[model samples]
Target: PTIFEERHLKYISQLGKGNFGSVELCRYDPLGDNTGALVAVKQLQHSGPDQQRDFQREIQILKALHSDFIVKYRGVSYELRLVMEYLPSGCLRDFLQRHRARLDASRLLLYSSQICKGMEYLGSRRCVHRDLAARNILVESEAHVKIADFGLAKLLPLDKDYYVVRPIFWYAPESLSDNIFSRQSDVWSFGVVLYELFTYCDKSCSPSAEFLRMMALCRLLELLEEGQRLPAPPACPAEVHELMKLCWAPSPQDRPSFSALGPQLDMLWSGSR
Candidate 1:
């Protein structure tokens, strides 16, 4: 099918928009048959050198990542458009917000485990998912979760240092201090993601300053306490809470590897209430 042909492009709906570009739902009628399969078209404004470079970076990252848990890039068009799989269930953040109360402990464990698996896959490829948050994850209709938005992802080099400025609340203490980022930092972000799964009670209210302060204090106190770590969140299961606490440790070296997290999360899920 000739995807670039203008006759094949049919605008469906606006999926999302941001400063860099706008994502639109599109339907492709290649053979003049309306199959109704929807796709997401990301159109970036071609301003100058920087924007063009960023667009190329996104394409390269998506092209390198190929996993069931990662969004598939269908194709790219004229350096301005990127076509990707359309997720009907939308972002994990939105889903978490809408279904927080209804989600059981077992369900939460299953979802979190899936996310860990995805992160593990990415980490194994020497790629760091700099932005591992609920908003960057997506849920499909059959309950399959996939990680999206590779704009911040980058291949780790053995020689040079990689620094990432992520959201302050979700960032590890070392990252906040502008230290070199590593796979462990991604685990720290996962801890924040798990926290969101637990306490997405109020969508309208951002994570309160009090909550952020509490998390920061917990990280600090974990440094002081040898055996006594930060207390677990009240809402999540004890085992899952413990995992989150370990992930948010002040020392990134203390955090478990993504590969090590699978079995632990599996055990927790098996014993979940």
Candidate 2:
């Protein structure tokens, strides 16, 4: 847990924009270590009090969470920059888009299962990830995915419930209507990510467009109202879609927990194998 010194980091290149600010790829050499490693540094762009509080909360969440399925958070450098292990393979979103044609059912299941495993750990720690989606997950390799981004995560009170936030597409009905977020709501978001996976991360299958279309057409009051759910993508196995539906269950209590989802996806993977 050594705090990084600004002198030890060399800018490599800009990675991409994250939720809070621009992320840069950097080369980090610890004092006297001689060896260096590539890392991602998220620079804090805003200094306002609200933004500062959010940034501090994110750092706290990252520092407390430890799991192979979760991103490895390195100590922060000076000037409010966050240093983290750089996953060379990049995000699951782009990886799926690039390798879409070649990804098989088993491979997709593997990624989903990894996400479930990560969320299982978060749930055990009473952390509710309000935003859980492919774009927030980093791919280390074909077989490994790590959940990243704690900007919207809340380490819940002992009652295991908190109220806040957005995410029109991935949010559950309860989340959208009442602003209640819990482990079950996270399961709903995972279901949306599963849709993205099965759809090969196709741009056309985005929930945003679907939500907008329904709204413009004057359909249901809410996108997910009246038993409406995203239709299963073509070629997606029936059982997988069933699980997605379970995750989208109207009642939060009916949604499967990450602990339940992990084994379910593993069973699907086994069958696919």
**TM-score, cand. 2:** 0.92
Clashes of each: 0, 0
lDDT of 2 by residue, 1-273 (tens): 468888988888998875457789988876647578888988777557777788888888898889999998988987688888899998898999999878999999999898999999999988988889888999999889999988788888775466565446887777766788888889999999999889877788777766665563224325567788888889999999999999999888888888888888999999998
Candidate 2 Cα lDDT to native: 0.84
Deviation of model 1 at 63, angstroms:
1.6
C-alpha lDDT of residue 204 in model 1: 38
Task: Judging by lDDT against the true structure, name the best candidate.
Answer: 2
Please give the lDDT score at residue 179 for candidate 2.
80
Off by over 4 Å in 1: 1-6, 160-166, 204-209, 212-231
Name model 2 segments beyond 4 Å from true. Answer: 18-20, 30-35, 216-221
How well does each candidate superpose onto the true structure, as a TM-score? 0.85, 0.92
lDDT of 1: 0.74
- What's the lDDT for all of these models? 0.74, 0.84
Q: Which candidate is the best by TM-score?
A: 2
